[PDB]
Amino acid sequence: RFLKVKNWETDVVLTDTLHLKSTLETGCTEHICMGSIMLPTKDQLFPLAKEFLDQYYSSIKRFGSKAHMDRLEEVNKEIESTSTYQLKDTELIYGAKHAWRNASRCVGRIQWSKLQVFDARDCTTAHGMFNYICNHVKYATNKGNLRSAITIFPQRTDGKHDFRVWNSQLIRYAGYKQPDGSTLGDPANVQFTEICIQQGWKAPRGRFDVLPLLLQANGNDPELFQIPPELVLEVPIRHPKFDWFKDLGLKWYGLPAVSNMLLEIGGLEFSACPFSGWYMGTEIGVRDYCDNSRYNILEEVAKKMDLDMRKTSSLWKDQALVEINIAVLYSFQSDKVTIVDHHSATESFIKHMENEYRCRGGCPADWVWIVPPMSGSITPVFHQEMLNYRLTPSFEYQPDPWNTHVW
Amino acid sequence: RFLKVKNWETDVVLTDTLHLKSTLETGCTEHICMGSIMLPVRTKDQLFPLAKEFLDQYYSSIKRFGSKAHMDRLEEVNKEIESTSTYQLKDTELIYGAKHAWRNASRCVGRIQWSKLQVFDARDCTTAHGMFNYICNHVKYATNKGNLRSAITIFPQRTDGKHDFRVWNSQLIRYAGYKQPDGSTLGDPANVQFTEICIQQGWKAPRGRFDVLPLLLQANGNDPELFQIPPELVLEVPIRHPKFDWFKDLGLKWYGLPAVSNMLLEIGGLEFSACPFSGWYMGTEIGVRDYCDNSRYNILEEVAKKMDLDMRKTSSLWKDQALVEINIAVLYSFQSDKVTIVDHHSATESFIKHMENEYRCRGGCPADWVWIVPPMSGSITPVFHQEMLNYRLTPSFEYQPDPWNTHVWK
Ligand code: HEM
Ligand code: HEM
Ligand SMILES: N=C(NCCC[C@H](N)C(=O)N[C@@H](CCN)C(N)=O)N[N+](=O)[O-]
Ligand SMILES: N=C(NCCC[C@H](N)C(=O)N[C@@H](CCN)C(N)=O)N[N+](=O)[O-]
Ligand SMILES: C[C@H](O)[C@H](O)[C@H]1CNc2nc(N)[nH]c(=O)c2N1
Ligand SMILES: C[C@H](O)[C@H](O)[C@H]1CNc2nc(N)[nH]c(=O)c2N1
Ligand SMILES: [Zn+2]
Fold it and tell me: Where (6R)-L-erythro-5,6,7,8-tetrahydrobiopterin is bound, by residue (chain B)?
């Protein structure tokens, strides 16, 4: 069927047909919606490959051509013989860009076509991975004028020689459990911060300690490496009015770079595919800084602002939230590092949605993730109906390696 | 089947078995989620089973399942249906049914209060004047001089579909909206079409910014009739700020009694098309949506200007700053006038406790995340971090088409 999507603020209705080409399941049923759940063979492979090549050739206006047919046969014979195949550089680039295009939880997809792809399929070791990663970080950071990029390591073979980056993001802060029973640094990384020590790392036991990369190549045991500090761009956070702010001693890194997902293109699985773009202000100011299970800093900021924290209805938490997020943005813009506010980013997404609807017939989107964690309804996406469904190529979740690795 | 739901802030995991009793569809499929879509005359045939299901739930709730009283009621209803094609609920079943439609309302964050609902039985009502009297009594009881009390008034159920009782207003109390020839709107933009119908029907509009609309009431399928709610019965709150003395000069005020009046209440297969209900406001409803939605009063700029915020660029977060103050004001004004209201922090925290309680004593709590999470400060409320399962249980409150689109004028 053909579904319709309405924006309740502008009345604009869009019709969706792209969903009709969905393959994977959503987790929902006619009886129950799981829209808010965080995570709901040669014979198998060729179909997948064919589906992919078909869209690739269609995208380049050579659908059904001899080239298309030839390629389809070549891959067909390759799988039948090698039980797998290799993507052409062209198909690789198209695949990665589209996996981003299809990321229903990503609000910055208007940038999807401008992705620098780094082919690391010739990589064989952890030092090699480190080398490729350092080059990605430097390229993408670009002294503050961030550029989206992804580095693709060798695809899975027999699952016994998988490449993996154990970190969740290339750059994050350490987390240690203290005697107090409290947590020093980032609580979200406590466990990882331990496996780094349990492996050899010498933690400074600080509040913002850039973690070491834990790289795994060809199924081997992961190895540690410290990213040249000169390559980790960091922003000290200050407020454009509260000169006391700085004493909070807060800072964040400029490069968001998801490194634990799995990239699936034409059936092939790339288990190590770190990618990066740039931050939306709220990710740091609202989630990293104010989540109760994270740096949980609202109370401190509240106190220095000297506001009545006696009653929830004074909305001190909300007032502080705003100020903190004003600081994050302020600091990044001041240090000339790329960053986008939730207002501008959501506006962009709406524009992207409209482009996608008319040039592609739709845009899979997960409302639960697209709407910013603060000021939801004053951003346009809140009033925008969205249809969520899975399309390939795609970025998928995968088990944390330390729960699957056989040392 | 069992389903796990987890809170990513506390790691608490709950198990849901309640969903096994969901009959109605959700709009989603194994291939598509319609979770953010706002809205995705029965036969004797499908009526008795609907009745039986309900009566079994009722008798089980009172620990009399399988009793003689239970079996006789089933036989009594079955006969009545075969005989008259419908059936009447006992007062007790009506009350139980009403409370459960609220208890099952997956988009309602105030459900911790479900068991305390005052049900007014208006099934003996035959005319619009009769409806007006019932509604006046409901508004006065509910308002209770500012100490709000949850209530619902239930008018006669649908029979053949040509004799429906309907409250044409979407809420018993709402402000008029007027579109000017220059394209701008005076009052509340959301109520413009309804305001026009009221004028066409004879209402003398005072054409101001906060004019309480007249009730347009339809009884037994007849053409609707106009009634003005006694002003002394309509409690309102002037909006001022704890620190901004100029806020009061924005000329804002809101009514204190929220009362949805356009939903359909379904109990045991029976359809109640006019069932106005009221509780009390969560601050953000007024402060974030009614006041700051671009298509509503939209006061962000004017408030931002007076605060002398940097409006040159969005990254100054002037909108976000103005938003908090306005919401501080709404809460402050209500508490000062001693009119019940709840802020989003307290409301969401209570809902999590209610939800956990429901999972243990009931096996679940259908909830719509998209609606439950507040329109501001989303992630600093516990619900944002809570996984929820949405499904439909009856009894329930359902949407129904606006009456002006279906009514056959006499
Ligand atoms: C350049 C601007 C970019 C912006 C502003 C942006 C913004 C966002 C935001 C705010 C999220 C949610 C993060 C969270 O809540 O954890 C997100 C998620 C995501 N983005 Fe983008 N993104 C950008 C670039 C990228 C790139 C370059 C890719 C892919 C190559 C991408 C793929 C995804 C995926 C797959 C997710 C979901 C990850 C998860 O489930 O944890 N994003 N993005
Ligand atoms: C005790 C006070 C109550 C509070 C604080 C509360 C709060 C809320 C809020 C914030 C909404 C969302 C409104 C919107 O965004 O349009 C809502 C929706 C809802 N509530 Fe409650 N509520 C209360 C009492 C009730 C009562 C008395 C009933 C039923 C007897 C009820 C039934 C529902 C239903 C059916 C919806 C969804 C309405 C729609 O879809 O438009 N609520 N509630
Ligand atoms: N802006 C991005 N955000 C995604 C990564 C940052 C995100 N806020 C985050 O903390 N993700 C966690 C996963 C959150 N559950 C991680 N993978 O370390 N991506 N980007 O490439 O531009
Ligand atoms: N707090 C309540 N809120 C629901 C009613 C107010 C809501 N903010 C509102 O404006 N609802 C619109 C529907 C909004 N789409 C209506 N039916 O007039 N309900 N209550 O019983 O206490
Ligand atoms: C339970 C719920 O799914 C969870 O808290 C989601 C909500 N929306 C989100 N949205 C984004 N962008 N990122 C998140 O981590 C979440 N967490
Ligand atoms: C499109 C989207 O579903 C829509 O704007 C929803 C989102 N969440 C909501 N939540 C509540 N409580 N009330 C609403 O009117 C809405 N509108
Ligand atoms: Zn769904």
Answer: 36, 370-371, 384
